[PDB]
Every structure is written in structure tokens, then in C-alpha cells.
Write a protein that binds this DNA or RNA. Sequence first.
RNA 1: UUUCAAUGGCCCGUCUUGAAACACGGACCAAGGAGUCUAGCAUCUAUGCGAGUGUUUGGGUGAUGAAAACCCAUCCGCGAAGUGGGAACGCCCUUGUGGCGUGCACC
RNA 2: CUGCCGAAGUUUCCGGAUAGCAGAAACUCAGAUCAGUUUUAUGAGUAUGUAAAAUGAGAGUU
RNA 3: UUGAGAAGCUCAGACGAGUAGGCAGGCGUGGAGGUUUGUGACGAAGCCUUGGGCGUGAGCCUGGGUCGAACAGCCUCUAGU
Lengths: 135, 124, 210, 52, 125, 40, 50
Amino acid sequence: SQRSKPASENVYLKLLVKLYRFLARRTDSRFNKAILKRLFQSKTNRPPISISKIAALTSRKSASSQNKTTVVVGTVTDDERMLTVPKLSIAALRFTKSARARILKAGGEVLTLDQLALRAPTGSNTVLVRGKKHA
Amino acid sequence: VNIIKKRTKPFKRHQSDRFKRVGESWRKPRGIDSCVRRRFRGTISMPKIGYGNNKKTRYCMPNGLKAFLVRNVSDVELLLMHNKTYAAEIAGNVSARKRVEIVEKARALGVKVTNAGAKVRSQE
Amino acid sequence: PFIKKLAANDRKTRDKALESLQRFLSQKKKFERLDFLKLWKGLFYCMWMADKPLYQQKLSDNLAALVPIVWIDNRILFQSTFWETMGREWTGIDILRTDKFYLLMRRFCAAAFRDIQTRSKTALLDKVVAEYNQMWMDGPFNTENLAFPNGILFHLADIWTEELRKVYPEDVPKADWYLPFDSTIKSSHNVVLRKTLPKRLDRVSEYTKD
Amino acid sequence: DSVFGSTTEVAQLKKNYFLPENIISNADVTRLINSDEIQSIVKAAGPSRVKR
Amino acid sequence: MKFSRDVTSSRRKQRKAHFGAPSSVRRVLMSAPLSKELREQYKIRSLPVRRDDQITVIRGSNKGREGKITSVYRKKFLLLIERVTREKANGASAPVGIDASKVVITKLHLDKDRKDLIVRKGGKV
Amino acid sequence: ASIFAPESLLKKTKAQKQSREQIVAAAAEKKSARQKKREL
Amino acid sequence: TVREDNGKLYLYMKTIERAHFPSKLWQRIKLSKNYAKALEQIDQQLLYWP
RNA sequence: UUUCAAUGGCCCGUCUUGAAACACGGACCAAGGAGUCUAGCAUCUAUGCGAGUGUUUGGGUGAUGAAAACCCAUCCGCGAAGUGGGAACGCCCUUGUGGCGUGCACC
RNA sequence: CUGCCGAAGUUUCCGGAUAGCAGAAACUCAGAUCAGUUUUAUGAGUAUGUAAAAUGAGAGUU
RNA sequence: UUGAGAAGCUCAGACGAGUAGGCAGGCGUGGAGGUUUGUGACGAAGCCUUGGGCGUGAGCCUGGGUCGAACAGCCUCUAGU
């Protein structure tokens, strides 16, 4: 379920792979190559990331969150433990209904990977993140 | 790119001539001691991928056309843009009434028919 | 207009609603921003449903020529709400429909330049350009929103100088014509936009303050 | 609209049901690939089927 | 479509019922359409065939032949008509059976029971 | 009566015109360098 | 597309703006019997098409 | 296709053992004839939702086929409570430098 | 039915735990390493061993 | 230059034994949902044939003969395949 093509049968994942196949081939961005590689991965190799972890990772140590978009090829779940959500711009394959509502109602924007490719076709000013693969 | 066949003989199953209960449809021998599987000298050949024919000339009849199965007048009209590449072949279960209609239509389209003389007579 | 009729499934009703819009946009009363946003939702689909190139390039002229009909007080709001409604719907368009919305912006880009020239007869040009530069910088060329597509702005850079020369065939006066481009090249957080906008823009320094 | 609802409003006739969201926003991928946003940064396209 | 669960659409059960019917059921199974004149005069579309009924053959090789119904052979679902026969090898004329649905009744063999039956199926005598 | 060219055609034409300019500019240079290289 | 109707050829065209109206989806023009002019009509009806 | 000429060419399957050999099975032909169904467990993949998830014990409901599809009240099961480095920014002719580092492995 | 990959056939304890051979996955990594190979000279005893040269190959892994 | 079934098209180089074992892609059979506005008494299915053709192959198409009522291609499902 990797390497050449995705094993997934979703036609909309196949369209996203189509878009980033072109971007990874007709640009010199390692971001587009990295996104394409992760689009081929299985559900087990694309662990979800939480709203809390995105907020923590962006304002980490030196903080200086600014307005860089956060990209994760996977699901952005919600952390109900945290009470206040900052203003975040996140691009992800999927958002849960709780995560999407909390980002929008108090914060910024939720994007899909094709909306991100139009804003940052080279991936510039993006914070690409991963989930903890150790389950 | 004229049509070249790497082989014209069929691949007959080993011992199919000796036994009537054994058909001639090719079966890959599984016996380790069998000389046909070991590919000794003088033994019969086996289907290999090297015997495969040119992709450009594959499926092509000796006249350079590919047989396209046709069951009614709708199928013949499909070959309007491909009369130089495909020949119409009427199915065996198409009646002699429909065969006539297919043959007249194919004649106007400039489409070769492989079996245009079947089940019909002529009267000039 | 009633907006609903402007997006109707037959061209006759859409044309009739357009004709009745001239009276609606001419009233000497203040219009809220949401009212113009609702109106531009119907007007966007009037253009989105346009069928043939002859019609959809005459309909674009009708929409662009509708700007001087609007009252002077709420004329900026009409143009500002068009560029907002085009920013949020630009990505939802498809290839077989972008070529006619590209002309709609060009006709509306020229409409702003013509309106600046018309107002410049009775008022100082610098004040009018400052009013429009505020609208340009608060809407499309704003750096505080990252959701505005770069396709709109690249098109605006491509047509800024040529649509300006059309309004002033003899010569254009000195003003802050290119201020939204300078402000957004210097201050935007979109690296792709700020790196290729100078290449696309045809800023002629001959008729700008040096 | 009551049987199914929307992606942001719950269905009236299905308790706690929202219409599914898509992992792509504009499914016309030719619009994204052949857009001014993307075509302005790609390197000059090589040839199609190349000469031998 | 049928909706009652008291009627079966099973081919096995429908064929068994037709080919194992008693003679009372077979009487209604072999019904024939009335002619147009009788249809508008007796207000009846079709009737079971009876002996001495005057009929016309509508289908088959014997199409157009008229005659009385000499016998209703219920065991074979066949009608025997007068002079509608076939020559045998020895010269004896073997009668030919025609299905009741392939004939049209042009004159009814009216009796008291048939008249009551006619007014029973909404029919003016 | 007059059908204006699509705006995407104008954008592609400008991009194609620029790319052709680089190709031709780097073709006269290629000829000169090849002649100097062949002499070497 | 070009289709033949009882001995006459027509150029059938459809646009995306009539996709939801199947009865009015396709429009056709009669192509001239002169082959040179039929090519010109295809060129002028399909102007700025790929 | 039948036959002829020249050249070559052992009878298959099983078992054996180093491969064998040998010993087994096979008069012929047709038909039938052997990893299936189900209950657990684990892995991988796909799909839905996601700190949640699972409608179908059951109730509601289904006018036309009603053993389907559709809807869900209360429970319940499971789950939960220093360096290196991917990617990106800004400089540097470029290398390279500077700020920022996800996952994972070190401390 | 065709295509592709492809052994071991045995060290060690002791029916197995192994190891090893052959694949899959998760990686990082050429500004680096690896080798049924030959070397330089000196260490020890022509052979043997050594650290760092020649040749080839990108390799190490869990 | 039209050569976007992007699951397509195209260019280049190297390689080709194979038991156990592993992994892909296909052929065929009975039944099911969809489809071919499908084939059929002007002849379905089957069978026969030193007729013709297609595929490396499993197999498939077809002419003639025989025959007399049904049957198939494609997408998916299923199995006493």
C-alpha cells in the first residue's frame, strides 16, 4: 500500500495524488515530493495529529507562531482537554467535526491539501508535521 | 510493420496424442522426473514469454486488420473512423436477416467483413 | 432583482432581473455590506450561467458598466464586495468557466480606473486614488488574509497598466496607481506572490511619484 | 435538506448526522494544475514524447 | 403485479394446478371469447365452451372453419368441431382438437342455466 | 461580432514567448561555444 | 462532434453551461456541402477551442 | 491433412534415494470426484467516524411485496480518563551560514 | 495459464529455541562506507596478522 | 503533432535455469444485481468438422454440417467453480 501508487480506492485521494504528481515533477520543491510520498502511505503510517499538538508544536520553545500554515497528511482530531484553541491555519487530508468547529469558531482556517497547493504550490512558509507512529 | 509470427504451430499438451482421455489443451507439466519439464533435447516445446508477438502487430489478421465482433448495425457504424485498422466479424448467432443489413452498411462505410458470405445466397 | 431571479435557469428572467437592477442600485440610500454581498452572490451566478462567448463578453460589459449607475456614496462598496465575492468563489470555478470570469475582473478593473477619472473632474485626483487604494488594500491586496487566491492578483498585475492606458489614451497623471502592488510585495506573507508579482506587474515609473 | 442536512447543520430526520466532508475542495484537478497560481512557478516543461 | 399472499406466482405450483385440475375447474379453464355481436348483445366478454355451441376457428391451420362443438374433451383441453377433421391412412377421418381459446363463439346454446349465468355476469339477455 | 481571445490563452502566450526567448538566446550562445570547443 | 442526419452533416456542440439541461444540451449547425466551406464553418464555430 | 526422406527422440504419475534405479498405480471412454463452512485470536490493507466508537437483544416503521430498506429509547462491549534529523524561511556567485525542526533514535 | 523472486539442504546448544540462507515493511544514508580480492611496510611466527593504498560496488541497518 | 483510458503516451539501458517456498496478472464454469434501446424459428444452446483466424498460454472468435428454444458480451456479487 505504498511506493508507486496508493492502495486506497477513494477517487478523491487519487485526484490529490494526480495534483501532487505534477507538482513533485514540474517543481524543485522537496515539500511537494514529501507530500506525494505521504499520500501513498497506509492509514497505519499516517497517524492522526491533534489540535493540542499542532498548537504546542507551532508555539514551541521560541514560539513565534506567525502565520505559517500547518500541513499534515492525515486526520486532525480534537483535544477536548485543552480549553482555548489559538488561531491556526491547518491543511490536512481530513478534519474531525469537533476539530474543524473549534479551529473555525475561535481561530483561523481549515484547508484541504488542494487548497494548500494553490496557496503554497512550492510549500513555502509551511509547517509540515507528523503524528506519533508508535500508536 | 508487416505481420510476423514467431511461431505458427500450436502448443500441444504432452502425451495428448497417446491418450484420448488427455486433451490437447496445454497443461504445464509438474513431474520433476518428466523430461518435458526439464526441457531435454528432442522433446516438445513449452509456452514461454519469448514466443510472444510484436505489440504493434498483435491481434492482427494476415491482412493487417484486427477482428472486431459485430452483432448489429450499431456495431458496424462504430468502425467509421477505424476502417483501416479493424475488420468487422459478424457473430455466429446473428440471423441471416441481420447479416444482410450489416453487410450493406459495412459496404458503405468501407469496412472489411471477415465472413460477409455466410448464410446468404446471391441473385444478380 | 431579488437575487433569486438573477440566478434563474432561463436567460430571459436573468436578463429581466438585470434590467431591474439599475433602478435598485440608483437609490440615494446607504447600503450595508451584507446587502451588496447577497446581491453579488446572485450577480456572480448570472455571470456563472452565461452560455456563449458573445453573450458572456457583452454581459460582462453590462456588469462593468453598472458601476457608474451605483450611487456615489456606496460605489466603493459595490466594487469592494465584487472583489470579495470573487476571492471566495475563484477556486470553486472550473477551467471551462475561468476564461469568462477573467474578463469580468478586467472589465471591473477598468471600471475602477474610469470611475477614478470621472471623480477626478470634480475632486483632486490624489484623494480619489487614496480612496480606491484603501479599497484595494483592504480587500484583494490585503496581507492580513492568506485565503485570497494569487490568480486574481496575477491577473490584476497583468492588466493594471494596460487597462489604465485605456482610460487615459493620451497620458495618465501622476498618482499612487501601483500602491497596492508595492504594499503587498513588501509586506505579504505569501512568498510565491511577492516573488513573482514584480515579474508580472508592468509598473511604469514614468507616471508615478518618484 | 431535512433528510440529509448539510456538512455544518445536522439533519433534522437523522439524529446527529452531518453530510460527509471531502478530502478535496475543488475536485476539478485540471483547474488546479492549469491555474495561474501553479503554472507561474513550474519550470519550463520538457518535451512530450521525445525524439530518439 | 400480484400483492395477495393467497395467490402463488410459482411456476411449479401454477403448472401443477393447471395440469392436475378436476373437471369442474377444467370447465372454466376452457373458455372462449364471444363474437363482437354477442359481446355487445350479452354484455359478456367470454364464456366456457359447451356442446352444440356454434364457433369459428380463429387460429391454427383450420383458421376460418365454422361448425358446432360436437364434444368438449376436458381430459385433453381440446374441442372437437363438426367436419373439422384430418384424413388418416385407411381413409377414416380422425377429428382434430382445437384449443378453446383459439375459437370464437358466434351462436350460444342458450338454456335456462346459461341465461341465468348471463345475467349473473352483468349481461342483458 | 468579435470574439476576444480567452485570457488563459494570453497568459500562456506570454509564458511561451518568454520561454522561446531563452531558448533562442541560449541557442546562439550554444553555436558559438560549440565552434570554440570544436577548435579546441 | 460531426453527425450525419438523413444525408446532411451537422456540427454538434455542447458547453458546460447547458450541462444540467439535457434537452438543450447539444446545439448543431448545418455543415455546407462544399468541403472547403465545411472546414471553414468548423473553424469558425469552434473558434478558440483546443 | 495424409505420407515419405534426413536428424533427433524412452512411460507417464507416485514413492524411494544423492538423482535414480527399483518397487507401486494405470485395458479403454464418458460422467462424478478432494483446503469447504463456521466460531475465536493475531497480522496487514481498505472504508466510516474519531476521545470516542459500535443501528439490527429489542422498539418504531415500512399501501403493494413488508424476511428488504429506513429510523433509535435505555443499556452494554471495547478505548480513553544536549545532539542527529524530514520540511520550510532569509542571506551567501554557489557551496555554505543563520533562525525554525515534525517522526524516530540518542542525552 | 503465464510472469517475477528464490533457498537451505547446517554452525551452536539441544523434539525445539536458534543462528544462517531468501523476501516484506520502518528507516537513514554518498562531505559513507563495505568487500570468499590484491596490497605498502613492519608486528609476531615463504606463509600469518596489522592499520592505512589499489580495484569494484552506494551502504549500514531495526 | 493532435501521442491526457495520467490507470494514458513516450524515451533509455540492463537482464531472462529453477525444486520447496513467496508474489503478481490473467483464462474458464454454475447462479445473482446492473448493463448492451444485446443475439434468436430468416434458427438459441449443444454436438461434429483434413474450413479460417486470434492469443506465449489458459482460451476465444468464426465458415460449413447437424440441430430445434433459448442464450451471451461488459461492470460487480457469489460458489457444491
